[PDB]
Structure formats: structure tokens, C-alpha cells
Design a protein around this ligand. Structure first.
Ligand code: NA
Length: 110
């Protein structure tokens, strides 16, 4: 697992990208905890091929271009409850073939 360090009260970006992203074929989600059998547990954000279509709240966003596979998660105004494991799942057409990536977030005070 890759580890991201950020500051409490500041935003963080959890990195995820898919170079061969296709607007007609791909979609993705972020969730809390390790990537499960399918989709994302405790889903925080989801895209279609082009755009964010669902979001837990405005605390979660994507600052990159979705259509180019720049699907890194930005979490605003981090508090202690945001620390832990996150799942970035790139959805690929078919079964048992999504790209699953766990990211650990650690948070400190400045
Ligand atoms: Na799949």
C-alpha cells in the first residue's frame, strides 16, 4: 500500500489514475476500507466515463479530468475520522478484472 500524509484541518489528495481510460467503457469509485469483491464499500464518490455522478457529500471531489483517467480523490478539511484505508476501484468491462488499489491516509497536526 502507498501511504499519504496530510495535515488535520487541511485537504488531502489520494492518488489514483488509469492511463488507458475510456469514456465509453470505464467508470470508477472511491470507498472506505479495502477494495471488496465488487464496487466500493462505504462509497464516497463515483464517476461514469466523463463525470462525478454520485458523492457522499461536498467533502469529496475529483480535481483532475475524469475522461483522462485522473481520478485522484481530494478530501477537504480533514479530521481524525478520515484517517485509514481507502479503496480506488477502476471499473473495467467484464468480471473479476477491475483495477483495485488500497491507499492508507495518515493525518498529523502542524
Ligand atoms: Na470488471
Amino acid at each position: 500500500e502507498d501511504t499519504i500524509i496530510g495535515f488535520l484541518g487541511q485537504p488531502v489528495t489520494l492518488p489514483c489514475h488509469y492511463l488507458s481510460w475510456s469514456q465509453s467503457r470505464n467508470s470508477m469509485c472511491w470507498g472506505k476500507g479495502s477494495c471488496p469483491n465488487s464496487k466500493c464499500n462505504a462509497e464516497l464518490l463515483r464517476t461514469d466515463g466523463t463525470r462525478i455522478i454520485s458523492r457522499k457529500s461536498t467533502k469529496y471531489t475529483l480535481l483532475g479530468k475524469v475522461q483522462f483517467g485522473e481520478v485522484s480523490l481530494t478530501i477537504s478539511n480533514t479530521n481524525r475520522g478520515d484517517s485509514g484505508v481507502y479503496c480506488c476501484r477502476i471499473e473495467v468491462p467484464g468480471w473479476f478484472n477491475d483495477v483495485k488499489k488500497n491507499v492508507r491516509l495518515e493525518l498529523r497536526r502542524a
